[PDB]
Amino acid sequence: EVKSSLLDNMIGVGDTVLLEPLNEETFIDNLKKRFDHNEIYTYIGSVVISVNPYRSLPIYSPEKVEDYRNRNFYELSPHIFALSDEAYRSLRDQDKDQCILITGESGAGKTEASKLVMSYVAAVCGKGAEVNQVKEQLLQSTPVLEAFGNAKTVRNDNSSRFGKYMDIEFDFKGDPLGGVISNYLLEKSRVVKQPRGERNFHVFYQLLSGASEELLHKLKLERDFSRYNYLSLDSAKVNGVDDAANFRTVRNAMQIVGFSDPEAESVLEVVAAVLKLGNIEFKPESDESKIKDKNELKEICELTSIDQVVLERAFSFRTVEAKQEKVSTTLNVAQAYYARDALAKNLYSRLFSWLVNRINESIKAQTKVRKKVMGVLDIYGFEIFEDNSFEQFIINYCNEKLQQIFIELTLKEEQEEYIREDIEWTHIDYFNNAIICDLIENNTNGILAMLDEECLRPGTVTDETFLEKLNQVCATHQHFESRMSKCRFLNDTTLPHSCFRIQHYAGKVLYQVEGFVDKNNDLLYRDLSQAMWKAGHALIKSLFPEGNPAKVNLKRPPTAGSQFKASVATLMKNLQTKNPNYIRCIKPNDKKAAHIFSESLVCHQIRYLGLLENVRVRRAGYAFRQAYEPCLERYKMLCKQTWPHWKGPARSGVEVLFNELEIPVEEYSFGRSKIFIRNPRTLFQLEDLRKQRLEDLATLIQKIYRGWKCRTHFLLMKGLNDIFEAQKIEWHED
């Protein structure tokens, strides 16, 4: 029994379910109030929102771990440790795999939340060096994966263009066995093209900024952003970002996580090769594509020990499958460019996988022993830019899928509780993520499927024919919009040509179709793979094991859309086979300032995260509920009957207390084990009454003390009054 409650000394509303009235203005004001009082954590039921303070708060001490450990969720004020205590105990006591999902805009705050969880777990499991070795590897390899997987977009200077899973694994005894990192959804298309105002992945800028002249000469790289098609000079500088210094930080992290100097160097040779591939151009011949200038190709092939004659032929001729008389298909110019790009972006994504695999080696469980895990899943935040392209579509689709299963589960669990307590369900109106997901992922008439079909069909294909196909097939959908599709005289700005709009849980998103076709083309065919496998360069050879003649060739996926869709399924499987918790991260400003709070930005993020819908689905019919006994205990000083030691059963006491406070019987309902209160007004009326009564109880004690003090002294004087009255009077005499 503990009487501590999140309600005690609560700054603003500690659990957003108790916000009243519920709207964006009250939500944002609440988050601003708490943030202004150094409270960065706020709940939505069990869900933790985290606003980044941009300064070190002394709230992650061993003492703070001792406070939250083995304690009930509602007993202490909002903190991430409450969530991690919850997840650790479920792992320890139920032997349940845990997955803590972290959504929202990327940055130092999301990384830190993940580090906080892993470090709480390491601290609390009491396994010492074995668990900290795994934890260190996960944590120190972060700047490495950032360099290769993060990029500056128009909205975020350090944005993750991939999803990352990390865990610490244990045997059922609680002994640490190892750990793992899993990457998903790497945005390969950024390797070969970037929107205006955006960069390619960090590592390219870090390399050309921080490498010595001698290193760049060995990489056959020129120190000039304008020399590489895959990088623009225009957006090359990120303010407050020193790519040279970051280069050194990434190289050092590499060493820390166990990369040898030759390996590190090998990695940079692959980055150089990726960069140089982007300078290859093609012209038509009378055999209809030929490389314009063989200089970059030559230097790439010397750098990588790849046969120049073979690689060049791979760009212009594709080996068709047996068994027909024709062996080689001639590639045209457009197809040669797709090949160049497919090679660059797959060489890159495989490098990225190789890095993760390398990091994983030292923490691999290497035992077939059944294990239970503590996992963190970090998914890139929702995106609504001025220009939304393929990249945003995949990201938003992934966020949509997650919100779907989350809202479904929160709804299903609130219902299972209401039933256990014999409480009536009231239908909750909520946005239907399912049909949006269906619009995107349906195999027969979904957007991804139509994009695939367009890319594979033999006719003339453009982003326009793609749009025209969507207009034909997706116009029946309530949530698909385009200029040529619909509509009600409701003040909507007219949709331009060459775009389509989707109603997502986070808001409507307008997608430009420009580049959809190109970015969906991702065919790494056998001739390319075999050219790579034959490289004398050990890392590159290892990156294309399917090119080994000893490995039987399989059918190669020709499009990106289908791979991303399967990758989304993979991470969902990972999540859904585990016990979930949730941290929703929010940036308070874009200046990275310690107290500065922009309600505009927070409002966008509130929408990206789908928090308001979380609040409604979670609050449901009754904002508050509590077991009768602790409820009575907390409020028994309110009516002068329950005070100080009754009434009857805890349930009886609750009823009589509410009757005497003249709380209308429509404001609450009696559960099988808990009182249920509809509106947070009721709860707060009780709380204001208690706070007044505690002032009275203080006076009770204070008056009793002042009283006992004087009474004691008076009794002393009375006891000695004979002596006192004898000393005032003479000794002698007559």
Helices first, then strands: H and E counts in the chain = 27, 19
Tell whether residue 644 is a contact of other proteins (CB under 8 A). Answer: yes
Tell whether 413 is in a known binding site.
Answer: no
Tell whether 109 is in a known binding site.
Answer: yes
Q: Is 141 exposed, middle or buried (0-12, 13-18, 19+ CB in 10 A)?
A: buried
To the query of whether residue 600 is one of the catalytic residues in this protein, the response is no
Rank residues 553 and 589 by Cβ distance to Mg ion and give the closer one. 553
According to DSSP, the β-strands at 624-627 and 98-104 are unpaired
Tell whether residue 717 is a contact of other proteins (CB under 8 A). Answer: yes
When binding is defined by CB under 8 A, the residue of 1, 93, 429, 734 that contacts other proteins is 1
Q: Find which of Mg ion, other proteins, none residue 553 binds, CB within 5 to 8 Å per kind.
A: Mg ion
To the query of whether residue 179 is one of the catalytic residues in this protein, the response is no
When binding is defined by CB under 5 A, the residue of 217, 420, 551, 672 that contacts Mg ion is 551
Dihedral sign of CA atoms 443, 444, 450, 455 in order:
positive
To the query of whether residue 529 is one of the catalytic residues in this protein, the response is no
When binding is defined by CB under 8 A, the residue of 645, 722, 728, 732 that contacts other proteins is 645
Tell whether residue 729 is a contact of other proteins (CB under 8 A). Answer: no
Q: In angstroms, what is the minimal distance from the CB of 313 to Mg ion?
A: 17
Residue 244: count other Cβ atoms within 10 Å of its Cβ: 14
Give backbone dihedrals phi and psi of 311, rounded to 5 degrees, phi first: -60, -45
Rounded to a whole number of angstroms, the distance between the first and last alpha carbons of the chain is 75
User: What is the C-alpha separation between 447 and 479, in angstroms, rounded?
Assistant: 12
Q: Find which of Mg ion, other proteins, none residue 310 binds, CB within 5 to 8 Å per kind.
A: none
Please, what's the b/e burial string for 115-136 (b: 16 or more CB within 10 A of its CB; e: otherwise)?
A: bbbbbbbbbbbebeebbbebbb
In the numeric block, which tokens belong to residue 603? 């409002």
To the query of whether residue 239 is one of the catalytic residues in this protein, the response is no
Q: Which of 84, 106, 200, 399 is catalytic?
A: 106
To the query of whether residue 12 is one of the catalytic residues in this protein, the response is no
Q: Which of 5, 42, 160, 581 is catalytic?
A: 160
Tell whether residue 545 is a contact of Mg ion (CB under 5 A). Answer: no
Tell whether residue 714 is a contact of other proteins (CB under 8 A). Answer: yes
Segment lying near other proteins (by CB under 8 A), choices 58-66, 343-351, 358-366, 640-648 = 640-648
Q: Which of 5, 42, 84, 111 is catalytic?
A: 111
| Bridge partners, residue 624, by sequence | 677
Residues 6+ apart with CB under 8 A from 155: 383, 385
When binding is defined by CB under 8 A, the residue of 649, 708, 720, 726 that contacts other proteins is 708
Tell whether 187 is in a known binding site.
Answer: no
Tell whether 498 is in a known binding site.
Answer: no
Tell whether residue 652 is a contact of Mg ion (CB under 5 A). Answer: no
Give backbone dihedrals phi and psi of 699, rounded to 5 degrees, phi first: -60, -45
What secondary structure does DSSP assign to 22-89, as a single string?
-SHHHHHHHHHHHHHTT--EEEETTEEEEE--SS--S---HHHHHHHTT--TTTSSS-HHHHHHHHHH
Give backbone dihedrals phi and psi of 533, rounded to 5 degrees, phi first: -60, -35
Tell whether residue 705 is a contact of other proteins (CB under 8 A). Answer: yes
Segment lying near other proteins (by CB under 8 A), choices 61-69, 145-153, 484-492, 704-712 = 704-712
CA dihedral 296, 198, 53, 253 (to 10 degrees): -10
When binding is defined by CB under 8 A, the residue of 80, 207, 301, 637 that contacts other proteins is 637
Q: Which of 299, 383, 441, 454 is catalytic?
A: 383
Tell whether residue 706 is a contact of other proteins (CB under 8 A). Answer: yes
Residues 6+ apart with CB under 8 A from 642: 632, 635, 636, 653, 656, 657
When binding is defined by CB under 8 A, the residue of 287, 422, 699, 726 that contacts other proteins is 699
Rank residues 370 and 645 by Cβ distance to other proteins and give the closer one. 645
Fill in the DSSP letter of residue 633.
Answer: H
User: What is the C-alpha separation between 143 and 107, in angstroms, rounded?
Assistant: 12
Tell whether 105 is in a known binding site.
Answer: yes
Residues 6+ apart with CB under 8 A from 647: 641, 653, 656, 657
Q: Which of 179, 210, 381, 547 is catalytic?
A: 381
Tell whether residue 695 is a contact of other proteins (CB under 8 A). Answer: yes
Tell whether residue 722 is a contact of other proteins (CB under 8 A). Answer: no
Q: In angstroms, what is the minimal distance from the CB of 714 to other proteins?
A: 4
Q: Find which of Mg ion, other proteins, none residue 327 binds, CB within 5 to 8 Å per kind.
A: none
Tell whether residue 319 is a contact of Mg ion (CB under 5 A). Answer: no
When binding is defined by CB under 8 A, the residue of 226, 353, 478, 702 that contacts other proteins is 702
Give backbone dihedrals phi and psi of 317, rounded to 5 degrees, phi first: -135, 130
When binding is defined by CB under 8 A, the residue of 484, 538, 698, 726 that contacts other proteins is 698
Rank residues 497 and 551 by Cβ distance to Mg ion and give the closer one. 551
User: What is the C-alpha separation between 144 and 150, in angstroms, rounded?
Assistant: 10
Tell whether 128 is in a known binding site.
Answer: no
To the query of whether residue 669 is one of the catalytic residues in this protein, the response is no
Tell whether residue 728 is a contact of other proteins (CB under 8 A). Answer: no
In the numeric block, which tokens belong to residue 720? 């000695």
Q: In angstroms, what is the minimal distance from the CB of 722 to other proteins?
A: 13
Dihedral sign of CA atoms 582, 588, 589, 591 in order:
negative
Tell whether 111 is in a known binding site.
Answer: yes
Tell whether 115 is in a known binding site.
Answer: no
To the query of whether residue 111 is one of the catalytic residues in this protein, the response is yes
Tell whether residue 713 is a contact of Mg ion (CB under 5 A). Answer: no
Q: In angstroms, what is the minimal distance from the CB of 530 to Mg ion?
A: 7
User: What is the C-alpha separation between 506 and 382, in angstroms, rounded?
Assistant: 8
Q: Find which of Mg ion, other proteins, none residue 3 binds, CB within 5 to 8 Å per kind.
A: other proteins
HEC-encoded secondary structure of 706-723:
HHHHHHHHHHHHHHHHHH
Catalytic residues: 106-107, 111, 156, 159-160, 381, 383
Known binding residues for ATP are 104-111
Chain residues that interact with Mg ion, rule: CB under 5 A:
551, 553
Chain residues that interact with other proteins, rule: CB under 8 A:
1-4, 637, 643-645, 694-711, 713-714, 717, 721
Known binding residues are 104-111
